[PDB]
């Protein structure tokens, strides 16, 4: 049996993102997987890293160091419940799919805050204690991203550069750093400009891909995969 | 005379980031510049891109598209006032400095939300009217970043890859996209690991650079600069 967490960051259930999230739930559910969705906007998920993320009293109340305090809070079971509820989902998951629209060559802020606050020292990594020594090894992650820009813009000599270039902070600096094996990204380019046929194509590619997702090997999450040449 | 906006993202006034923000204010003030700081945590700045960012009648109330609705709201003057407040600061500024700790090879979520919400269509870019034709043409931007990782970790053959690689979504995908000229980044590596003497040096290096900031040329914000290809 396999467990999947979908971390979903779109405001609108009728959106293209919503449909990709819903086809993932439908297909993984059909396969008999255990499926959980964190719908961040619906949850009004807190993005800001603040001292409210620690319950009780601080490791150093005179000078606030978010990383130190959250690490100590993790070890002492004193993190805020919104964070520990997400950590439980991640701990249980074999695969974490992130479904989002590209905002400024990155994730929407609400999802950036999920990464900042949920993947804390002691849970996802230690110092030292990262990349292959990270704490989420064994797990798979997958970025399912939609863009405004066309595929052709996202080439080496296109205006936006290769799409792999923007993946680096997410794939390498975040997911690989925490120990995930990273499956190849799903990138659904420019659905707002696409026709209905093409947008079905994209949804159906994704549903089709999901049928065999458990048979994929991860990408080599290297500086060479992203940039090289 | 020159106007500077510092967009600052750290929870703790006594932090290394707070020090670097203060020395910027002090130095630029000493030069006779006009200086404004947006202290995002102190402001409790809203990072989430939601339908609360538009106060008027939506273009399409059945299906919410944040980009479309914020573009129309900008033209109509129905955006939330926290957004308009920031836009005014940007509009008036000759130079925008971003002062932040690196979180997951990127900006903290509160600052991601500033980018997501403040830099809307009509204000920061138009389609057409992006990259060299972006609406913030003539303005300078500069990222002043602090890290956990050391400079050696952030080299082409270090565990983190070259520091320029993480700059791409920020400098190119965001700032250059909006028409900014990008000054070379200020990266203060690993202050937590550094000796007191080295920290004092990194602070003084920033102050000294600021003495001559108005004589600098921007970087060529290209894939070649960031990746060497
Ligand atoms: C703050 C901000 C920053 C951004 N920065 C960038 C950037 O850096 N780079 C970039 O490339 N883009 C950028 N974008 C654009 C953004 O990535 C796209 O607008 C987004 O990816 C579009 O996805 P969506 O789900 O919102 O599309 P939607 O508008 O929801 O949908 C696209 C179309 O598909 C339709 N649809 C929905 N479900 C289905 C279905 N099942 N079958 C067929 N059609 C369906 C919808 O009805 C709609 O007509 C930015 C946008 C914002 C708001
Ligand atoms: C969610 C999260 C994700 C992160 N992801 C990454 C990542 O991807 N990559 C990465 O490399 N790092 C990462 N980090 C680490 C983070 O970038 C560093 O912790 C941060 O940059 C350190 O800066 P600071 O201002 O917080 O340091 P501080 O801890 O405030 O300062 C360091 C020291 O300098 C002292 N100091 C302050 N002012 C002065 C002064 N004027 N002169 C001398 N000493 C002074 C302080 O008292 C302290 O002792 C992450 C951290 C978090 C919390
Ligand atoms: Zn990697
Ligand atoms: Zn550029």
What does the model show?
The PDB classes it as oxidoreductase. 2 copies of one chain form a homodimer. Chain A is of the alpha/beta class. The first copy, chain A, has a single domain, classed as 3-Layer(aba) Sandwich (Rossmann fold). Helices cover 36% and strands 14% of the residues of chain A. In chain A, strands 1, 2, 3, 4, 5 and 6 form a 6-stranded parallel beta sheet that branches. In chain A, helix 1 packs parallel to helix 6 (196-211). The longest helix of chain A has 16 residues, at 196-211. Chain A is globular, with a radius of gyration of 18 Å. Chain A starts with a strand and ends with a helix. The interface between A and B is large, with 54 and 51 residues. The structure holds flavin-adenine dinucleotide (2 copies) and zinc ion (2 copies). One flavin-adenine dinucleotide sits between chains B (10, 15-17, 19, 101-105, 146-149, 191-192, 199-200, 203) and A (49, 65-67, 116, 173).
Write the SSE topology.
Two copies of one chain form a homodimer.
Chain A: E1 3-8, H1 16-30, E2 34-39, H2 66-75, H3 81-92, E3 95-101, H4 109-118, E4 140-146, H5 163-176, E5 181-182, E6 186-188, H6 196-211, H7 223-227
Parallel strand pairs in A: 1-2, 1-3, 3-4, 4-5, 4-6
Helix pairs in contact in A: 1-6
The complex binds flavin-adenine dinucleotide (2 copies) and zinc ion (2 copies).
One flavin-adenine dinucleotide (FAD) sits between chains A (10, 12, 15-17, 19, 101-105, 146-149, 191-192, 196, 199-200, 203) and B (49, 65-67, 116, 173).
């Amino acid at each position: 049996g396999k467990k999947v967490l979908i971390v979903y960051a779109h405001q609108e259930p009728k959106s293209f993102n919503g449909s990709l999230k819903n086809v993932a739930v439908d297909e993984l559910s059909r396969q008999g997987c255990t499926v959980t969705v964190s719908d961040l906007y619906a949850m009004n998920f807190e993005p800001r890293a603040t001292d409210k993320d620690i319950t009780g009293t601080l490791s150093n109340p005179e000078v606030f160091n978010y990383g130190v305090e959250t690490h100590e809070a993790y070890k002492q079971r004193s993190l805020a419940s919104d964070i520990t509820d997400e950590q439980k989902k991640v701990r249980e998951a074999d695969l974490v799919i992130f479904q989002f629209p590209l905002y400024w060559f990155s994730v929407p802020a609400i999802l950036k805050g999920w990464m900042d606050r949920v993947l804390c020292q002691g849970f996802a990594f230690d110092i030292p204690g990262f990349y292959d020594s990270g704490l989420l090894q064994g797990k798979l992650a997958l970025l399912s991203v939609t863009t405004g820009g066309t595929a052709e813009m996202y080439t080496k000599t296109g205006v936006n550069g290769d799409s792999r270039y923007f993946l680096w902070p997410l794939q390498h600096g975040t997911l690989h750093f925490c120990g995930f094996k990273v499956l190849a990204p799903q990138i659904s380019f420019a659905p707002e400009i696409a026709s209905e046929e093409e947008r079905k194509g994209m949804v159906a590619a994704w549903s089709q891909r999901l049928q065999t997702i458990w048979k994929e090997e991860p990408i080599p999450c290297t500086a060479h995969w992203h940039f090289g040449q």
